[PDB]
Design a protein around this ligand. Structure first.
Ligand SMILES: [Zn+2]
Ligand SMILES: [Zn+2]
Ligand SMILES: [Zn+2]
Ligand SMILES: [Zn+2]
Lengths: 330, 330
């Protein structure tokens, strides 16, 4: 009956409209503290984040889930600062993404389980801030280390009730192997979001996962390099499908009967250091609305396509609350 | 003056100096996220303080902690143990073998700016300035490692701070490193070619020394003799005896290169980037820790006929000439 945020526990009712896959800053462990000038300054980054969260809040957002892991350079002290300033709840994450350092890559399943548990049950670093979600990643068939991470995430979820959310390459149908590994651990699909699922046009891939009880993360809705296709780096990151094509997958899954299984987000951020230097600016040029893109553009778009407001409130309020509220078994 | 974690020191203050050491071999952010890996931060600090006090009692006055950003260098911890043990510690900038994406994606100009920040401004928000630049290859340089070497040469050329390297001596890495450094105009007198004790190729070593390079014979206690079937320890430590490594010091002395020699242990008080208990295995191999050089190597060389004055030149005179900022130490 409580969800952990960077400001402490909140009720299901307090979470309200929740974006389930976002970032304050996509970076690397230790990088923000070592080279804040990469972002102009820590101050400038903080300011940009407060502005964006305030705009999001004005558009209706009440909570974001920051799925930045240790190796995404998650700085929960920065999260707490911006959450306070903007009055938007922020759920922090544990887990590991694609850039684990050696001190992580060398660890056993038992050790990784202890680390994820520490961040959920005790706190992150010395902040006392506890993670409310576990983030994991594969890009095609899991490496041996990625298997350890998936197993450890499942075990941490099974001991705490905190859910697991994933990065996939939806083209490579990764959710299928992620699912297989989670189920081998006894994890309920009700505690798992298969993320970046909006990157495919193969509806049958999505429906098969949904039929199994998985949550489906349609979470890069504004990602498109339409208008900048000759920007190789931007095209690689954003793809060449329109935001409308991505958004229409939400309607497609509603129509199949899977509205309760849908989670929607922007996968936005206010700083971004793990890619080409100015990728943040390019992204802002693509989507000036930032995190407010879902409420301001996507919801009205789906309404115009015939989706009732009530269904959209279900997807953006009810589903996230059911996903996040700790349980074995949602 | 030479920048230490406690402030700039004069040449006269440096005394007996171990030029390639670590307080803790880890990964960026790792110590702060998972201090229990080390028992606790307190336990790690106590172990480091005990170890430095032992080194000091054996005559050590300064160590150069060549831990980079990606070795998880925590300069706040360095300052803490430096003050507690009364041993000078020089901190490092540069990059080693585990750069995260936020480093790997950076250009030569951006890396140069980062290294310069840590030398001229300070490390993180601590105001502690680096007194050396650490770089690394394992065989032929990767494209990224080339950028790191070029950026290190540029930062050295702007500041007078020297560059020290990790090599695979068996692959004669020193020759490519030298070539890249000189293609940037760097004086060999500002460069220590490190881990040079893992070779029997005296002609490779003397050729470099003759060109003005400093030769880092810096892993003298590294040996898995008595634990050869420990795959992980033998991979890290090798099977070359400590006596063989030490006799290379005498070999270079006997060929007239005493002024080009730098000696050290490459020791540490915590180690998280390898197998979990590697620190224990290492302490079982070399209970003297950083006091191995003064307690074991020096008397061994004395017994082999090397005059004390030569050993003082190597352990006191050479490191001071190496560390004191210049563009040409001659
Ligand atoms: Zn992702
Ligand atoms: Zn993301
Ligand atoms: Zn090394
Ligand atoms: Zn080292």
């Amino acid at each position: 009956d409580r969800i952990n945020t960077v400001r402490g526990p909140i009720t299901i009712s307090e979470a309200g409209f929740t974006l389930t896959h976002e970032h304050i800053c996509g970076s690397s462990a230790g990088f923000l503290r070592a080279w804040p000038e990469f972002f102009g300054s820590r101050k400038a980054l903080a300011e940009k984040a407060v502005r964006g969260l305030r705009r999001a809040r004005a558009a209706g957002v009440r909570t974001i889930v920051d799925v930045s892991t240790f190796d995404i350079g998650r700085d929960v002290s920065l999260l707490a600062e911006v959450s306070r300033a903007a009055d938007v709840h922020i759920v922090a994450a544990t887990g590991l993404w694609f850039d684990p350092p050696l001190s992580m890559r060398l660890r056993s399943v038992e050790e990784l389980t202890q680390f994820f548990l520490r961040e959920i049950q005790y706190g992150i670093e010395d902040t006392g801030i506890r993670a409310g979600i576990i983030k994991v990643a594969t890009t095609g068939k899991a490496t041996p280390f990625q298997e350890l991470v998936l197993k450890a995430a499942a075990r941490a979820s099974l001991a705490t009730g905190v859910p697991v959310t994933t990065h996939t390459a939806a083209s490579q149908r990764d959710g299928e192997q992620q699912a297989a590994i989670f189920e081998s651990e006894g994890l309920s699909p009700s505690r798992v979001c298969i993320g970046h699922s909006d990157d495919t046009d193969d509806l049958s891939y999505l429906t098969a996962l949904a039929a199994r009880g998985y949550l489906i993360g349609l979470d890069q809705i504004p990602f498109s390099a339409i208008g900048l296709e000759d920007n190789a780096s931007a095209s690689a990151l954003l793809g060449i499908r329109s935001w409308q094509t991505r958004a229409l997958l939400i309607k497609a899954l509603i129509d199949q009967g899977y509205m309760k299984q849908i989670l929607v987000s922007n996968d936005w951020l206010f700083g971004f250091s793990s890619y080409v230097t100015n990728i943040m600016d390019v992204m802002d040029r693509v989507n000036p609305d930032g995190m407010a893109f879902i409420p301001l553009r996507v919801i009205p778009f789906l309404r115009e396509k015939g989706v009732p407001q009530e269904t959209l409130a279900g997807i953006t309020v009810t589903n996230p609350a059911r996903f996040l509220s700790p349980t074995l078994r949602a």
